[PDB]
């Protein structure tokens, strides 16, 4: 029989997306834009574009929905406590930094800066939009991005309220109330909880704690040297960016017809032949939009399915303790 | 060469424009590019006209579409009241037409027809960027949680001295209803040279 | 009128208008037309 | 509301034209000759097909929904009931 | 038994017209003149 005489206190970093970028699409801004007749012939096709909308809307408020039921767990927002000693555990690499004008941790400010969002929806007072872009074409084609309903300021405030809830009681403060505990003696009944005796813990708090230290130390400078630790969010990103320049990029397309512009169409030929025209652009636009919606209805599937995870790793993991075996990351949890 | 058309004045700073039979509607701007003596018009990414050459004076004039964005009606249960807010979303309130028919600019867009507050209550209507409205109409930055913070020490434990069995209910859908489409009765109703015709799309 | 309308006509530019000139036989004209193939179309006058 | 929701606008689209003269079929056949009546006969036929795809595929993406919304109620109902639960939030908030 | 019938069903759709004058293609490009041709390509090529 093999028995360890000694231990490693390692920390696994794990990235999982919960949520996407938002889109509305204006099917007649898309398709008809600025045209008359082109709107007239349109609403010949029936309720294609309501049908857009209301799976753009129901996509948008799942998002929002995900995001609530991952992060926003809790009802109460716990303050770290002044005092910022737990038995020798240093949390100053997760407890977030006053000195910041963001209330987010040293780590924090290097996920949010590692990951480069292509447009957040924000307001544009059109100066940007002219003179010396791709979001800008997006825009005027119809594509707009929604910004979500928890901003960054408000999730980052309900992770520390997480962290210090999670540091000053244990599991508890999942269960019911937050009943105060020192992290000593939460560490002893993780030690039990994981089949280890606590006097363990009570003997060598010193050197675990120094584990501790240089496991964040390490997770910070790998986060620091390595760019694709969060190359899931980058990946996610970056598929959302490309929908948005593929499905601009279709309005280039002729779809058998004389050229690619409505007025061009107009203005060279007569509505009895450009009517012929201006039904295979609708048709091909409208191929385009219906296949982007599905795209972008597997996505928010997907991400559904990516952030029940997430809020079911955070239940078990933060707010209890999970012994369930490769799940909160590899080793005794 | 071109049609017996007669030029118009030029105007700068929304109207429609014909540029060599290139017809379309948006602001005109002076251009910083470097047309070559040979290029009349401009093309961007969408395949669409950016940029002009005027065939009287040879100045470059940028084509931008004019100002747009989405109207978002905020509007509590008709069965409550009538009045309702509008959301521009995408548009300041300096911006800010095609609709024939309290100010408070937001990240999201400018909201107009809501009153904002500076206490916070809890999210009954997801406007955006943090804010949400409730029933006048008001807008508030919607509430995280409750204030509370844990009174943590070196030797401080709390343990209960009794407790309240509760039972909470959880709803989940484990099926939806069946649905059988007949394309022939739904495409072709009581006709045969559609059915023919619909025959040869194959076996979708 | 391949790609224009014979009335609107009168509202667009062009950048150089070639007037081709000929004469052929009244059965003849048929190959007059893209993507037509005949003996005036493969040895006389071709259109694109 | 859903389903029924789907149901309504996939019996509303064929009101729809999609291009041609009228929506009715009885209409197209007996005001114009299947030379011209067939091309207008195959706009409706496309439209049609192209709502009962998009029906489809979104019933396909609400079915899979479904299957992982059961799954998951199955997956409570063996943990929580016929057993006892040690994930936190798993059964209900608080010690199962 | 699925991704099979699946790319089956896939290869089969090729013996479809789609309003065409007939499923293929080289037909089409010899019995009609590029005028009246390209009318049925475009519908091969959707349905496709």
């Not at chain 1, 309903?149 to 508890?172: N, R």
């Not at chain 1, 030690?191 to 708090?205: A, D, H, P, R, S």
């Not at chain 2, 209960?160 to 909470?168: E, G, K, L, Q």
Request: charged content about 15%; overall charge negative.
């Amino acid at each position: 029989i093999a028995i360890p005489t000694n231990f490693t206190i390692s920390v696994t970093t794990e990235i999982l997306p919960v949520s996407m970028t938002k889109t509305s699409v204006d099917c007649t801004m898309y398709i008809c834009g600025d045209s008359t007749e082109c709107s007239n012939l349109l609403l010949q096709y029936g309720s294609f574009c309501t049908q857009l909308k209301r799976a753009l809307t129901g996509i948008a408020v799942e998002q929002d929905k995900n995001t609530q039921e991952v992060f926003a767990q809790v009802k109460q927002i716990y303050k770290t406590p002044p005092i910022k000693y737990f038995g020798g555990f240093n949390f100053s690499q997760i407890l977030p930094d006053p000195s910041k004008p963001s209330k987010r941790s040293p780590i924090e400010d290097l996920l949010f800066n590692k990951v480069t969002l292509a447009d957040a929806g924000f307001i544009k007072q059109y100066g940007d939009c002219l003179g010396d872009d791709l979001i800008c074409a997006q825009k005027f084609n119809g594509l707009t991005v929604l910004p979500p309903l928890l901003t960054d300021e408000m999730i980052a405030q309900y992770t520390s309220a997480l962290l210090a809830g999670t540091i000053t009681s244990g599991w508890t403060f999942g269960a019911g109330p937050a009943l105060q505990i020192p992290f000593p003696m939460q560490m002893a009944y993780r030690f039990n909880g994981i089949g280890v005796t606590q006097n363990v813990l009570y003997e060598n708090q010193k050197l675990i704690a120094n584990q501790f230290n240089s496991a964040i130390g390490k997770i910070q400078d790998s986060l620091s040297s390595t760019p694709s630790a969060l190359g899931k969010l980058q990946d996610v990103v970056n598929h959302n960016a490309q929908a948005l320049n593929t499905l601009v990029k279709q309005l280039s397309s002729k779809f058998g017809a004389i050229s690619s512009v409505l007025n061009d169409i107009l203005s060279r030929l007569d509505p009895p032949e450009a009517e012929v025209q201006i039904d295979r652009l609708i048709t091909g636009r409208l191929q385009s939009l219906q296949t982007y919606v599905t795209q972008q209805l597997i996505r928010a599937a997907e991400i559904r399915a990516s952030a029940n995870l997430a809020a079911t790793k955070m239940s078990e993991c933060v707010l209890g303790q999970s012994k369930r075996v490769d799940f909160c990351g590899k080793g005794y949890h | 060469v071109c049609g017996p058309k007669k030029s118009t004045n030029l105007v700068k700073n929304c109207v429609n424009f014909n540029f060599n039979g290139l017809t379309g509607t948006g602001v005109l701007t002076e251009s910083n590019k470097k047309f070559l003596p040979f290029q009349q018009f401009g093309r961007d990414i969408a395949d669409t006209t950016d940029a002009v050459r005027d065939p009287q004076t040879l100045e470059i004039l940028d084509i931008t579409p004019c100002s747009f964005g989405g109207v978002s009606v905020i509007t509590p249960g008709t069965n409550t009241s009538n009045q309702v807010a509008v959301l521009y979303q995408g548009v300041n309130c300096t911006e800010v037409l095609t609709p024939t028919w309290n100010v408070f600019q937001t990240r999201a867009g400018c909201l107009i027809g809501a009153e904002y507050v500076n206490n916070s209550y809890e999210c009954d209507i997801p406007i955006g960027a943090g804010i949400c409205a409730s029933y006048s109409i008001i807008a508030y930055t919607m509430s995280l949680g409750a204030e509370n913070s844990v009174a943590y020490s070196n030797n401080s434990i709390a343990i209960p001295t009794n407790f309240t069995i509760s039972v909470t209910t959880e709803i989940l859908p484990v099926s939806m209803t069946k649905t059988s489409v007949d394309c022939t009765m739904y495409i072709c109703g009581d006709s045969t040279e559609c059915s023919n015709l619909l025959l040869q799309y194959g076996s979708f | 009128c391949y790609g224009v309308s014979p009335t609107k006509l009168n509202d667009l530019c062009f950048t150089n208008v070639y007037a081709d000139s000929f004469v052929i036989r009244g059965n003849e004209v048929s190959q007059i037309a893209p993507g037509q193939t005949g003996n005036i179309a493969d040895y006389n006058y071709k259109l694109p």
